Amino acid sequence: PNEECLQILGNGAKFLSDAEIIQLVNAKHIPAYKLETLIETHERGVSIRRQLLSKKLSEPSSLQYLPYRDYNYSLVMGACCENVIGYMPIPVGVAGPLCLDEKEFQVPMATTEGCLVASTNRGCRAIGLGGGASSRVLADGMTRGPVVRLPRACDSAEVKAWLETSEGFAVIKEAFDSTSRFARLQKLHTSIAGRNLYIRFQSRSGDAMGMNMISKGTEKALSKLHEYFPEMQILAVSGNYCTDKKPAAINWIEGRGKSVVCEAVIPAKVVREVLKTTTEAMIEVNINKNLVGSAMAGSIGGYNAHAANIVTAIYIACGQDAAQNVGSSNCITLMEASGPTNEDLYISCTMPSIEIGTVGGGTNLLPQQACLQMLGVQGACKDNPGENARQLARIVCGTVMAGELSLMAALAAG
Template sequence: MKYCNTVFSGASSEVLSEGMTRAPVVTMPTVVHAAHLKKWIEEPQRIDYLREVFSSTTRFGKLQKVDATVAGRHVYLRFSCSTGDAMGMNMVGKGINTVMADLQQNHFPELRLVSLSGNMCIDKKPSALNWINGRGKSVVAGVTLTGDVVRKVLKTTPAAMAELNVTKNLVGSAMAGSIGGFNAHASNVVTACFLAMGQDPAQNVESSTCITQMELINNGEDLYVSVTMPSIEVGTIGGGTGLPAAKACLSMALGNIPQENPGDGARALARVVAGTVLAGEISLLAALSSGHLISAHMDLNRKPSTTI
């Protein structure tokens, strides 16, 4: 895969991997049949055949891999696919539906498709699977903040922000048993971006999984901040992206980013989302570490009093 880098006024980002997933669940006559299906699907020579069947339904979608999980007589087949500039769930669903029909007709007549989605996709729900393996676009973004900027602009210190990030975002979230919630408020930013740019707001659940890291560098003088987001699910075509307001916002967000090949737009949008989350994490952690969170809300977020 080609790695993609964009710099946002000092912050940089990379798309690490991409793949929209769908995981149908099937039932086989016995556990032995289920094991046979898993072994057959995962044989290295099968992927080219499955890719050919999948590609018969789409110009831009490409099947990347299939993982099979057995639970008794049930087999969950997690397909991962690239989808060009579309978020791609419908594209992937159509292709996999064709693959499942081919499997049943030509290879496993005893196979019974229970559902095109068996919840191992996993869509619109928190999941360790997405946290570990990713879904949609897996993105990392980072920036160096000089000590002068932290003190003069953010009104705190690099050491205070680094300490707070460990105690709140890392240890606090671990003590709460969080899955992918090792951040201050990534969901706030992801939801705003999704609503503005025509994305599926329900996919905020997995798209907001994020770990924020703040590290002292240059002998403790400066601060390096990064966010790692394994499952940002976005597209620049399809769905709500065609609405006038969404099109305008997408144009503003992506106007200066080259989009020469299919998929460049969606990858760029995922990097914009990660870069915006990065800024939001810096803002909130600075406000908390300086003790300005409530005073700022009181000063800036209250309706002015009216006189009669």
């Protein structure tokens, strides 16, 4: 019906059928934007959106194998996704044990690339027979890099000098830190371009990746800066000086999120039996591929074989922002001869800009929390704020090193 359908809606939506609510869209009665709140259950809302979508597609049977039933939409709606028509299953394999810092980890990897999980698993095996890997977090601080503008370059210079004094920095730090308990503003990084001023705010953010919290603190910091400099115009809360989800030398040099190093010595016996190559062959490929090769290609921060493969796979499994693989994959892989007879392989990976978290975003979803719980880093750390996210970053750097070892060995053997 048409008129009777509106009456029952005013009382609920359960008494109206699927075909009746879809008829309210077609025959203009009530618009399409009112759909999330109106329907009772979340799963039925997804079903009605899929039927509406089906008639717009040139092949309505497209959605047949896109699944949607029995998924927990309660944590997704109004938090992680909009216009939800279902979910996308990504196969999850396991590579391990990764022997890292006197512990053993089973690393979940969501991917559809054949041989990737198997390769990473072989890398872990080589590391494990070689006495294990060790890693350190060198720095920690998510950033946001707004652009502001003053009437003149002489004015923007005045603002830069003011922020660089002990007093000016104290005023902006107090504003920034007041927005949340984990907001602790580190030293600012500023760059002038004429009358423009790019300001890089950096702060730890507990176990969150921290972009929402740092953005809150930045908005408050710029409002405080407005009081001391009324002619200043906030052009954008991000002027790409952060830098988020684009390649940027500033992330490579200053770091962003977690800066991490990892290392291991692979005994000569393990290089031959597990990796099917030699230490000499591995060093030759590493120098001429990951250093010289990347140099000839004009790379900034891409001094590695396939760090992005491991970063992406762990990120999708563990509820991270996979778009941040742009900067998070930044990595330099070094190799040299080691031990008394110089036949053992010393490997290290350095990743200055791993953008990561174990609370918020996709880490609030239960399947993603399962993969985080495998690693023992799910949620916030009560006793040591930021320790779970720090640990996950160490696991990412260590797993990348396992991937580097294995693929470089395949390339070396020919």
